Design a protein around this nucleic acid. Structure first.
Length: 210
RNA sequence: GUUAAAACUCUUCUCAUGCUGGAUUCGAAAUUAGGUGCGCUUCGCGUUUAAGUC
């Protein structure tokens, strides 16, 4: 199940609403899966159909946790959204969230130029082959995660990526917190905000050991 | 195949008001309207009257 680990760089700042006034310091892998499925359907590819069901564990999309300055990745706090990396502290917190208003449009947004980790593990090898093609599309062109994406909010650019085979605390929340998503298909324009109750972090279902 | 898309941080408002390139310094220092040229040329103070007289 060789994987691909890369460094996402925010050329433009992002914003992602977690509802009830909540916002995220880092983008979730659900957005990476959504954008990758959109450009796979733009490529008119087989992987698009694999993405089209919104239920395909063939490739596991991990969350785009921020790569720390000296630490590897910021680890979640118990019963909190604060992110702390092991090497030093670098508490991402709510500092990157800044309130903004746009001709009456009030909302919040994240500082660009902070690094983000990426890891997509493709079990099937043919899935890996289409993964390296759509990952070359992520490498040369850009990846877009968040809301007001078409305005440009959420531009992401790969710097350092290696296709490395991948060899407990839940790094990402696993389906009680409500990680809400939607399958907004191009043909099936039905928008389904599914509020999956699940265990939060600090304790794309994935876990990270010590 | 992102709680997504769907929304231009937009409209109004002149770097403007005061302050003179002004002050000081003479176009004068040197040079003679000088050099050449005869107021010359033509025209006789002539004409008239006895030193008479007793």
């Amino acid at each position: 199940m060789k994987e691909i680990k890369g460094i996402l760089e925010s050329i433009t700042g992002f914003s992602i609403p977690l509802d009830n006034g909540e916002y995220a310091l880092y983008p979730a892998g659900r957005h990476l899966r959504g954008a990758i499925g959109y450009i796979a359907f733009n490529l008119d590819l087989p992987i698009s159909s694999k993405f089209l069901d919104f239920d395909f564990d063939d490739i596991i999309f991990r969350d785009l946790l921020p790569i720390s300055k000296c630490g590897k990745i910021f680890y979640p706090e118990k019963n909190s959204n604060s992110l702390k990396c092991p090497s030093c502290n670098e508490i991402y917190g709510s500092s990157v969230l800044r309130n903004i208003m746009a001709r009456g449009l009030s909302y919040k947004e994240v500082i660009e130029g902070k690094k983000y980790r990426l890891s997509i593990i493709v079990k099937d090898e043919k899935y890996l082959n289409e993964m390296e093609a759509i990952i070359r599309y992520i490498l040369s062109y850009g990846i877009y995660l968040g809301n007001k994406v078409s305005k440009g909010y959420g531009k992401f650019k790969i710097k350092e990526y290696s296709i490395v085979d991948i060899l407990v605390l839940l790094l990402s929340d696993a389906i009680e917190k409500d990680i809400v998503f939607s399958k907004k298909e191009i043909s099936s324009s039905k928008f389904e905000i599914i509020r999956k109750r699940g265990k939060a972090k600090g304790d794309f279902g994935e876990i990270i050991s010590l």
